[PDB]
Amino acid sequence: SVPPGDINTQPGSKIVFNAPYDDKHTYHIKITNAGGRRIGWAIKTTNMRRLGVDPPSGVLDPSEKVLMAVSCDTFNAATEDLNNDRICIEWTNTPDGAAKQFRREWFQGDGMVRRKNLPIEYNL
Amino acid sequence: SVPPGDINTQPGSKIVFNAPYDDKHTYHIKITNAGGRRIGWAIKTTNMRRLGVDPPSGVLDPSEKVLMAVSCDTFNAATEDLNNDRICIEWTNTPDGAAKQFRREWFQGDGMVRRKNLPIEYNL
Amino acid sequence: SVPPGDINTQPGSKIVFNAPYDDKHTYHIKITNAGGRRIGWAIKTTNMRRLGVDPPSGVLDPSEKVLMAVSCDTFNAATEDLNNDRICIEWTNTPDGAAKQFRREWFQGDGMVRRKNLPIEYNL
Amino acid sequence: SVPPGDINTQPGSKIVFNAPYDDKHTYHIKITNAGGRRIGWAIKTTNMRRLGVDPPSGVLDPSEKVLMAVSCDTFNAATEDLNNDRICIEWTNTPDGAAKQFRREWFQGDGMVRRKNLPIEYNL
Structure with missing residues (x-):
């Protein structure tokens, strides 16, 4: 079809996790449909074990x-890797006559x- | 960046496998860079077990x-599924100064x- | 008297605030008495208006x-200064026979x- | 950093103000850098109204x-408080490459x- 429009994020480049890591911390992200047509988006992380999202996908008008x-x-910043976490944002336009429900x-x-990456920065 | 150009396939819609399935059959596909810029492409199947590709990825000038x-x-068209095989083609443009070597x-x-699907049709 | 012992923080260098800034966000800090004697500590910020602490002071055994x-x-990261926020930690040892209650x-x-500084980093 | 060195005072314990108190009396103090490194010091009183210092702060080599x-x-000893006046001396070491100018x-x-207290004794 036609290349999808861009989206806007807050943050828009990375995302920092500040210690201490001994409790489930919950940060937020703002996704914004900068585009002209509707969109469908979905999220992928690099650590199904550690991170978690919700909602994981959706539809956004313009x-x-x-x-x-x-x-x-929680975890153990001493032991695990901290340079390889990432947040993945995938989106595409929606089929000519779509319903608001991700498919x-x-x-x-x-x-x-389209894609966008939000890398996780661990602050000790 | 900028949405990638299209590619051309032969076949360009599906691909039929004619029985009998008692040997290893080898079909072919023609990928053609219809685009204006170089491209990187790679293939994905639905049955790593049954199907096989080669080469699995590459670079194509325009x-x-x-x-x-x-x-x-070989297999047993009696026992297995035949409605769910597919051939997946993914491609994107290449970085402004790239080396002919898939990365x-x-x-x-x-x-x-970009993606394109070639479904496998089993002919009995 | 005798110079006080050190303390440990988590984070231990800075502290990041991730946007968006349209909701009261609540981060945490871990203070730890690395020292040999009791201590009294208290916190000072640079923006009584924006930031807030609690508890603001206390006593910690070793x-x-x-x-x-x-x-x-909440605020408006477009208007306000963001390079000059800081978190101040002051502590000293306690009187030979003290009651646990900051004085x-x-x-x-x-x-x-003793003073330790935790600067605030605003992430947009 | 590293705990600061001691200083020496003259007097070194208190300071007496002899009556009569019907005129501005001017006493003196000798501060001496007993330490190994430079220092920055500053003075604080308990009666901005009654007492006065000068210079109020400075830098001293070793x-x-x-x-x-x-x-x-001037004042009225017959009624004013005289048990609560004090002289406060604060000092600390100076940054590795400092300019002789208090900051x-x-x-x-x-x-x-570091602190040192010189209490004021009113002699009637």
């Missing part, structure tokens, strides 16, 4: 926005898919 | 073309990725 | 620890006072 | 010394601060 929540479980398919089918 | 070979091992990364970064 | 909560009200006086007295 | 002048305005900051900063 100029519409959403607030999703990232979680971080995985949209990605699977032939078409264009 | 108007350049390639011939890849699909394989199909996975190209996909990983933030940006645009 | 090896004892505390968790204080920093708050951040301002301890500072006002004759002897030694 | 073994260097200074003479500051305390003032005492308030030094105190505000990340480090240790």
Whole structure:
């Protein structure tokens, strides 16, 4: 079809997790549909074990926005890696007559898919 | 960046596998860079067990073309599923000064990725 | 008297506030008495208006620890200064036979006072 | 950093103000840097109204010394408080490459601060 529009994030470059890490911390993100047509987006992390999202996917009209929540479980910054965590944002436009309900398919089918990465910075 | 150009396939819609399935059959595909800029492409199947590709990924200048070979091992069209096989083609443009050598990364970064599906039709 | 012992913080260098700034966010800090004797500590910020602490002061035995909560009200990262916020930690040892209850006086007295700074980093 | 060195005073324990109190009396103090490194010092009184200092703060190399002048305005011993006056001496070491010029900051900063009290004795 036609390349999708951009989205806006807050933060818009990274995301910092401040210690101490001995309690489930919950940060937030603002997704904003900068685009002209609707969109479908979905999130992917690098640590299903540690991080958590919700909601993991959705539909946004244009100029519409959403607030999703990232979680971080406890852990041991001493031991684990901290340079390789990331937050992945995928989105694409929605099929000519779509319903407000995310449909995985949209990605699977032939078409264009956009990305954005939000890396996690661990602050000790 | 900028949405990638289209590619051309032969076949361009599906791909049929004719029985009997008692040997390893080897079909072919023609990928053609219809685009204006170089591209990086890579293939994904739905049955790592049954199908096989080669080469699995590459770089194509514009108007350049390639011939890849699909394989199909023996099996038992009685017992297994045949409605769910697929061939996946992913491609994207290449970084402003790239070396002719596919680099996975190209996909990983933030940006645009195109896809095309070639479904496998089993003919009994 | 005798120079006070060190304390440990989590984080231990700075503290990041991630946008968006349209909701009161509440971060935490871990203070830990690395010292050999009891201590009295108290906190000072640079923006009584924006930030907030609690508890603002206390007493910690040795090896004892505390968790204080920093708050951040809403604001307008476009208007305000963001390079000049700081978190101040002051502590000193306690009088030979003290009761666990912070006493301002301890500072006002004759002897030694230790300071540690936690600067606030605003992440947009 | 590192705990500061001691200083020496003359007097070194108190300071007496002899009546009559019907005129501005001007006493003196000798501050002496007993320490190994430079220092920054500053004075605080308990009666901005009655007492006065000058100079109020300075820098002293090691073994260097200074003479500051305390003032005492007229008043009415017969009724005013006389048990609560004090003279406060604060000092700390100076930043590795400092300019002989007192900088308030030094105190505000990340480090240790020493005190010494000179109480005022009113002699009737």
